Structures are given as C-alpha cells and as structure tokens.
Enzyme design. Structure first.
Site, PDB file in Angstrom:
ATOM      1  N   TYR A  14     -55.672  71.006   5.070  1.00  0.00           N
ATOM      2  CA  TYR A  14     -54.310  71.395   4.709  1.00  0.00           C
ATOM      3  C   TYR A  14     -53.859  70.708   3.420  1.00  0.00           C
ATOM      4  O   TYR A  14     -53.332  71.354   2.510  1.00  0.00           O
ATOM      5  CB  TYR A  14     -53.337  71.065   5.843  1.00  0.00           C
ATOM      6  CG  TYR A  14     -51.892  71.185   5.431  1.00  0.00           C
ATOM      7  CD1 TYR A  14     -51.259  72.418   5.385  1.00  0.00           C
ATOM      8  CD2 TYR A  14     -51.151  70.058   5.104  1.00  0.00           C
ATOM      9  CE1 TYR A  14     -49.931  72.527   5.002  1.00  0.00           C
ATOM     10  CE2 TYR A  14     -49.834  70.158   4.722  1.00  0.00           C
ATOM     11  CZ  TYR A  14     -49.223  71.390   4.674  1.00  0.00           C
ATOM     12  OH  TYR A  14     -47.891  71.470   4.297  1.00  0.00           O
ATOM     13  N   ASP A  38     -39.177  70.533   7.587  1.00  0.00           N
ATOM     14  CA  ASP A  38     -39.563  69.841   6.372  1.00  0.00           C
ATOM     15  C   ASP A  38     -38.404  69.851   5.386  1.00  0.00           C
ATOM     16  O   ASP A  38     -38.154  70.875   4.754  1.00  0.00           O
ATOM     17  CB  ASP A  38     -40.792  70.519   5.766  1.00  0.00           C
ATOM     18  CG  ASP A  38     -41.342  69.783   4.563  1.00  0.00           C
ATOM     19  OD1 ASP A  38     -40.630  68.960   3.957  1.00  0.00           O
ATOM     20  OD2 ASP A  38     -42.507  70.043   4.210  1.00  0.00           O
TER      21      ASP A  38
END
Length: 125
Positions: A14, A38
């Site tokens: 990732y 986030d």
C-alpha cells in the site's frame, strides 16, 4: 484472512503504491464496502467512487512521496498498523506528515477499514 506475514506485505505494498501515486491500484486494494477515516476523528468516507476521489485529491497533485519509517505491526486477525512519513508540497513549501495507518483486511485480502492517525502536531517543514 491474511496471515500476519501477509498483512506485512499488503501494508508495505500500500505504501509503495501511494509513493508512486497509482490511484487505480490503491483503490483496487479496498473492499467494496470499505471505509476510510483520514485523519482519524473525521467522518468515514464509504463507496469506491468516494475513496477514489479522496486519493485523487490527495495524490493527484503529482509529487507526493511516502515511506515506511518502521516495520509493519501485524496481528493474527487480519489487522495491522504501520508508521510512515508522507512528503508533499504545500503552498510551494516542502512539508512532511508523520502518520500511522491502522488497517483491517477482509477474508479476500482487501482493505475493509483504513484509519490514519495524524494531525497538525505531526506536520513539519
């Protein structure tokens, strides 16, 4: 469910994808009903299109770099956590953010939940 070793791999993968900025590849890592918080503390975003738009906003600027600043911490229940640093350009100023991502993967090896811990205290120039 990814083994602990497999969580280490997926989570490092990732970061690699963020670092080169392949949006489509990042979005494919997520499950269809995945959520992204986030920074953690903000409302979750859900839906593949929404998650793609999130990464487009964040990375579509072109010069964002990302790298692990320590090993991936992995559990035996398909979850993990990792420290990293994002480097990017803010108002023509180079800046960095220290982040920790906590992820849970589903039985298909896809990200079910992403939680990114960071705030202004983690931002520098």
């Amino acid at each position: 469910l990814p083994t602990a070793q497999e969580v280490q791999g997926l989570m490092a993968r990732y970061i690699e994808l963020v670092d080169v900025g392949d949006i489509e590849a990042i979005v494919q890592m997520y499950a269809d009903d995945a959520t992204v918080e986030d920074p953690f503390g903000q409302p979750p975003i859900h839906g593949r299109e929404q998650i793609a738009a999130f990464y487009r906003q964040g990375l579509g600027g072109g010069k964002v770099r990302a790298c692990l600043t320590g090993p991936v911490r992995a559990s035996h229940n398909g979850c993990g956590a990792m420290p990293f640093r994002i480097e990017m350009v803010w108002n023509g100023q180079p800046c960095a953010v220290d982040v920790i991502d906590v992820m849970r993967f589903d039985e298909h090896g896809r990200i079910q939940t992403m939680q990114a811990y960071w705030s202004e205290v983690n931002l520098s120039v």
